[PDB]
């Protein structure tokens, strides 16, 4: 019943809009996303809402492709069904200033890193040798 303190993660909180994407189709291909899903997913310019309440972080994506929402505690594995409909086991940790999100499914793994750079939030999606960089701006 008191007002809690802030945290470093507060740099991520807010409302973000996708402004650029690079190599996302190739990332999705490497992940195993099929043709029609890649085409539709690649058009979307989501709004991402990041919030924190105590130890719980929520990342919501409001998207013309597929809305998603995850809530989690750093270091604590959870179930996630991804925008492309994978059922994955995810763990998100804060490593320095970078949120590191590892998704595991069917013996595969991909990592999504989120970092503040100037006024942007940069999202770096890595499947094996293939990286996609997605830049969000404040909405």
Ligand X SMILES: COc1ccc(CCC(=O)O)cc1C
**Residues in touch with ligand X (CB under 6 A):** 28, 31, 33, 41, 61, 82-84, 123, 125, 134
Nearest CA to 125 out of 33, 47, 55, 36 is that of 33
Indicate the residue among 2 and 38 with the shorter CB distance to ligand X: 38
Torsion of CA 43, 35, 105, 96, to 10 degrees: -30
134 is in an annotated binding site: yes
Q: Is 54 exposed, middle or buried (0-12, 13-18, 19+ CB in 10 A)?
A: exposed
Q: How far apart are CA 52 and CA 46, in angstroms?
A: 20
| SS3 at position 13 | coil
Question: CB of residue 2 vs ligand X: minimum separation in angstroms?
Answer: 34
CB of 1 to ligand X, least distance (A): 35
Q: Which is nearer to ligand X, 8 or 42 (CB)?
A: 42
135 is in an annotated binding site: yes
| CB 67 to ligand X: min, Å | 11
Least distance from ligand X to the Cβ atom of residue 117, Å: 15
CB nearer to ligand X: give 31 or 99. Answer: 31
Smaller CB separation from ligand X, 6 or 78: 78
Please calculate the CA angle 82-48-52 and round it to the nearest 5 degrees: 95
Structure-token pair, residue 80: 């996630």
Task: Please tell me whether 116 is known to bind a ligand.
Answer: no
- Known binding residues are 134-136
- Known binding residues for a fatty acid are 134-136
């Amino acid at each position: 019943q008191q007002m809690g303190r802030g945290s470093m993660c507060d740099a991520f909180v807010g409302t973000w809009k996708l402004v650029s994407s690079e190599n996302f189709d190739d990332y999705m291909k490497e992940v195993g996303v099929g043709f029609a899903t890649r085409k539709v997913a690649g058009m979307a310019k989501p709004n991402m809402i990041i919030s924190v309440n105590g130890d719980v972080i929520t990342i919501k994506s409001e998207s013309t492709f597929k809305n998603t929402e995850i809530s989690f505690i750093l270091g604590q594995e959870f179930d996630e069904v991804t925008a492309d409909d994978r059922k994955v086991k995810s763990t998100i940790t804060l490593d320095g200033g970078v949120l590191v999100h590892v998704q595991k499914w069917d013996g595969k793994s991909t990592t999504i890193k989120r970092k503040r750079e100037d006024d942007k939030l940069v999202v770096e999606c890595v499947m094996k040798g293939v990286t996609s960089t997605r830049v969000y701006e404040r909405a």
